[PDB]
Design a protein around this ligand. Structure first.
Ligand SMILES: Nc1ncnc2c1ncn2[C@@H]1O[C@H](COP(=O)(O)OP(=O)(O)NP(=O)(O)O)[C@@H](O)[C@H]1O
Ligand SMILES: Nc1ncnc2c1ncn2[C@@H]1O[C@H](COP(=O)(O)OP(=O)(O)NP(=O)(O)O)[C@@H](O)[C@H]1O
Ligand SMILES: [Mg+2]
Ligand SMILES: [Mg+2]
Lengths: 477, 477
């Protein structure tokens, strides 16, 4: 019944002509202005990232003093937004080449030149060569004044409406660094409001490693603690940071400050709140994803497994694959790897807490144990079920009332002939201890886990086995 | 305490030099190959869209016969994917200009030339001028053979590795139209598997308006019914289409085929299944978003309000704002407008069903009424609550048992002195009718709504008022 037309019929008839790929810059400008970003406000993120990059370059050539700052100014009656950094600036060649050429970035050349890259490569944000054009999403006119930190280089003014052409002229009175003035479009006047700009900086950019001022007021006093050496962060600093990133008023019960370079770059701080979890926490994460100190996503969907959604804090990775709009490239293998790494590290962290302070862990488990049970029921990977299962606590017939035990402690108490873990679910210990089911087990000198919570029975039935041992309900026959 | 540095100090010193924006094509190619699409499989979507566009152009110059088809061929041992269309093809100028220039599209020029655009503008998919380069995500070598439908124009071979350069030569034996051969990268050999390609076509492209064949087998027999005149679609065609798009085995209880041009373009079909809703339907949409017959999103997040997640079907709009990757540009005003339009139209549709066949509607309400109650509780907009409230059904003291009434029917029966709607929640009618609360009301000759479902009381308390009338529980005092 087949119907094909694909057939190998073609042969080349003439000499080949060689050609370079070209680009329609006017369309590209339009695409970047209208078809890349879902929200126009990210132009502020992009200009601040450029200011930071320029300052980072200056910091490196400070070997070889000057204040390294980013200033923002709003003027409502003028309808302008201005950003000025005290960074490396641009000479005429740089202005024409780097600003005038889409997809051209000064990042690679700066990094390559530096003898040792590691430190600078971590700090430099820009990689695509398009971020500057985000200005034209919101501005009818863009003027750039720049003065390079070179020998006796002159100052320059670069100007454009984003309509295919720009102009450059020598300029006097330009301070070292770069000032960008945006004359905002009529439908974008909100970015000449101080409160509005403050919200955008707080959202994306406040953890930038240089002071940001808005109309003279410091916006970003709080530092990116995740980058720092964990021992140099006091308990008080963690309380304060937790409250800020969690938008909370309580304090953290637990703090895990995790840094790794292998198998991927991770700089992270996680907190467990002291308050018991809300019904929206249980309903449905509040961990935010950063890359090189800039926000990528405010609520992970998802760099953590669902059952860890009770965690608060920040994960920063240099290795996050970004799309051109600087959102996450979805479901990359690196994200799945990151998620698995974090799950393993948090499980081990919580396990370590249960051994360091059982009383405190017990309080944690009363309140957050539901998430563990859910995590076990949710996955079909046995190794994951069994790892999360290590976090579970139960009472036991072999222990006095109120005393909690783990599956691992139970198993350590078994005898080598045996491969069954017995449990009995009941509203409370008195009824467990006086169940006919328990007397049977008691005859056989078999220890029984007592399970009073929900959904304890369902969890254990899902878990099925633990450490090669069958989970068997005593409440039968 | 202020600390500023932003000061108006600059003046231009020299003449301005004028410059055109330029582009670094090598970086752009890299960005498109690595930083745009979250899944490499969309190259198939993009090449098929191009085939469709080429065929649509041919269809128009058929005024002024030939079969209009898209063929795919996989060859596993060769590691190739081939697509050939019998469309308008490209001459040398077109090959060099359109394929060789990123962000350059032949769409505008074709549309502008046509005396009447409306029909063609609806059919033509391409707008950015980048889709072709998606081939380099998966191929090390791309060869294009094309023959224009012109007077005595010769055939051509265009060839590239996506490394900045390409070659063009005259070629013999090229059939009218365009054939593209991809030599797949080692990590992309899955696209030389027939089953894999079939999955991708089914996912994005099967509703394209031209037959698609894969290794000689027709893939897309089922047509995009949403575009058609509603009366030309039989009940049987709707059953079949419903089962396909809902991945279901039952049949639709209700069918709403909605087309509008104002205030925006909408071509849509919604179905309510006859089966009662599953626990994942209730847990958490299965309406898919299309644009010009190509998938944009398979599960709306979200073009419908949450409470309408029980609907199945397809919404197609020419007006969907797309980002460069051809995902939805998030939270555009047009999406919110679309959502509101659809909500209004579905509410009116269901209201019309309750009047056309109350018995059938009653069956619908038993099973799906939970979604209405949820929708009322979820929103804070009173006009929306009251519109969804029109869908609610209750028993009444003024009607015989089993008979259902609406809030509007209740209100029509009130007397002009009165502004209260009374209700009584109870497990069943017998207990309602014999409640002491009801006797009180019965004394005052006041009609009482009897509410046996959950969460009836909560819903009515949230609703608060209806048509300027207070909802008041009789179960007090
Ligand atoms: N404030 C600034 N100071 C100095 N140089 C700047 C400044 N802003 C932009 N540049 C230069 O202009 C180039 C283009 O900036 P931009 O379009 O943001 O691309 P990018 O920073 O290189 N990469 P990306 O932000 O990922 O798109 C930068 O690489 C710098 O070389
Ligand atoms: N199969 C084809 N037949 C004829 N012309 C084609 C074909 N494929 C590509 N072209 C031409 O090459 C141009 C570039 O294609 P492409 O890069 O997909 O951009 P586009 O279709 O115009 N817009 P978009 O798909 O939104 O990126 C098209 O506009 C056509 O002019
Ligand atoms: Mg940048
Ligand atoms: Mg295309």
């Amino acid at each position: 019944t087949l119907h094909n037309i694909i057939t190998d019929t073609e042969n080349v008839q003439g000499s080949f002509s060689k050609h370079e790929f070209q680009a329609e810059t006017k369309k590209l400008l339009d695409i970047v202005a209208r078809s890349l970003y879902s929200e126009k406000e990210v132009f502020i993120r992009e200009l601040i990232s450029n200011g930071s990059d320029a300052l980072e370059k200056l910091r490196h050539r400070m070997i070889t003093t000057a204040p390294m700052e980013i200033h923002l100014q709003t003027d409502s009656v003028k309808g302008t937004f201005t950003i000025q950094d005290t960074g490396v600036g641009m000479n005429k060649e740089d202005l024409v080449s780097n600003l005038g050429t889409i997809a051209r970035s000064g990042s690679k050349a700066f990094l390559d030149a530096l003898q040792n890259q590691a430190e600078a490569s971590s700090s430099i944000i820009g990689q695509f060569g398009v971020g500057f054009y985000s200005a034209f999403m919101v501005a009818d006119k863009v003027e750039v004044y720049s003065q390079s930190a070179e020998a006796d280089a002159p100052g320059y003014k670069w100007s454009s409406d984003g309509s295919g052409v720009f102009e450059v002229a020598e300029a006097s009175g330009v301070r070292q660094g770069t000032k960008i003035v945006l004359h905002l479009k009529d439908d974008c006047k909100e970015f000449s409001s101080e409160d509005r700009v403050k919200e955008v900086v707080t959202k994306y950019s406040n953890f930038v490693s240089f002071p940001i001022f808005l109309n003279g007021r410091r916006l970003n006093t709080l530092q990116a603690l995740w980058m720092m050496e964990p021992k140099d962060i006091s308990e008080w600093q963690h309380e304060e940071f937790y409250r800020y990133v969690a938008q909370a008023y309580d304090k953290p019960r637990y703090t895990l400050h995790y840094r790794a370079d292998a198998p991927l770059n991770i700089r992270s701080i996680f907190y467990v709140p002291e308050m018991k979890p809300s019904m929206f926490d249980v309903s449905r994460s509040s961990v935010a994803l950063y890359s090189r100190k800039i926000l990528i996503q405010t609520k992970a969907t998802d760099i953590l497994p669902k059952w860890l959604r009770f965690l608060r804090g920040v994960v920063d990775s240099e290795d996050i694959p970004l799309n051109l709009s600087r959102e996450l490239l979805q479901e990359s293998a690196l994200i799945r790897k990151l998620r698995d790494v974090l799950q393993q590290r948090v499980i081990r962290f919580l396990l370590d807490q249960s051994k360091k302070d059982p009383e405190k862990y017990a309080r944690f488990f009363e309140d957050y144990g539901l998430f563990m049970r859910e995590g076990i029921v949710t996955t079909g990977e046995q190794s994951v079920k069994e790892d999360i299962a290590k976090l579970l606590r139960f009472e036991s017939s072999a222990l006095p009332a109120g005393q909690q035990t783990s599956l691992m402690e139970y198993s350590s108490r078994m005898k080598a002939g045996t491969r069954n873990i017995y449990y009995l679910c009941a509203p409370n210990r008195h009824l467990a201890e006086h169940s006919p089911y328990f007397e049977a087990m008691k005859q056989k000198d078999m220890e029984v886990l007592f399970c009073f919570e929900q959904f304890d029975e369902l969890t254990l039935l899902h878990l099925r086995e633990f450490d090669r041992k069958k989970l068997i309900s005593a409440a039968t026959d």
